Amino acid sequence: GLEAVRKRPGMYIGSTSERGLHHLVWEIVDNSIDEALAGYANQIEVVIEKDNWIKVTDNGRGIPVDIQEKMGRPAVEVILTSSVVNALSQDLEVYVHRNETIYHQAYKKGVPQFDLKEVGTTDKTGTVIRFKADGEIFTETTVYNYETLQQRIRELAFLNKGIQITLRDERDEENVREDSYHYE
Ligand SMILES: COC(=O)NCc1cc(-c2sc(-c3ccccc3)nc2N2CCC(O)CC2)[nH]n1
Numbered sequence: 001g002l003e004a005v006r007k008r009p010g011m012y013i014g015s016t017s018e019r020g021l022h023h024l025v026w027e028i029v030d031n032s033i034d035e036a037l038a039g040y041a042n043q044i045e046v047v048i049e050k051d052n053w054i055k056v057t058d059n060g061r062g063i064p065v066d067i068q069e070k071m072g073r074p075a076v077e078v079i080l081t082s083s084v085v086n087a088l089s090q091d092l093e094v095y096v097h098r099n100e101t102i103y104h105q106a107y108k109k110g111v112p113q114f115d116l117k118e119v120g121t122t123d124k125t126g127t128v129i130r131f132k133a134d135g136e137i138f139t140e141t142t143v144y145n146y147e148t149l150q151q152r153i154r155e156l157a158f159l160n161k162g163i164q165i166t167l168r169d170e171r172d173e174e175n176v177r178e179d180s181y182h183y184e
Pocket residue numbers: 027028029031032035058060061062063064079080083126127129
């Protein structure tokens with residue numbers, strides 16, 4: 001089912017060009033926005049990291065991790081192994097804060113590298129997604145454009161007043177830029 005994505009990506013994502021690259025960010029973010037619209041998240045952060053990794057953080061409830069009765073996998077693994085973003089990423093990581101626990105899993109091309117495991121304790125809730133778009137699939141470019149992300153971020157915040165959405169470019173550690181939107 002997921003190899004179907006990696007082989008016919010545009011049928012899911014729409015071209016493998018730059019707009020396709022940026023579509024990835026919006027898929028994860030839209031999801032965080034759902035968490036806000038459901039009334040739990042009020043802080044969303046997007047970071048462009050070295051290597052053009054992308055990180056997205058919200059403080060919603062965190063993707064569920066309970067064993068989803070049917071195959072015996074944590075719901076979050078079940079969900080991530082249906083994520084187009086995961087499928088079109090050469091590496092993807094997730095961290096869930098839930099039940100005062102930090103849960104972690106990593107993937108390659110949508111394939112789980114190991115079982116979901118607890119890697120810490122926390123007094124927060126929420127989800128962290130870090131993914132690195134697949135170079136094999138996004139030829140042409142794998143470099144995110146700041147302006148493009150920023151404009152969409154701004155609309156998204158104005159569309160969802162009361163939700164703080166922060167964008168930050170860390171691809172140059174000596175020169176770090178951030179914009180943060182929070183409309184009353
Ligand atoms: C896969 O990566 C993301 O989409 N990350 C953004 C995100 C998603 C969620 C949550 S919390 C939750 C949830 C649902 C029921 C009860 C408690 C929490 N469900 C989700 N989504 C639902 C849609 C799926 O595509 C991804 C996971 N929090 N942050």
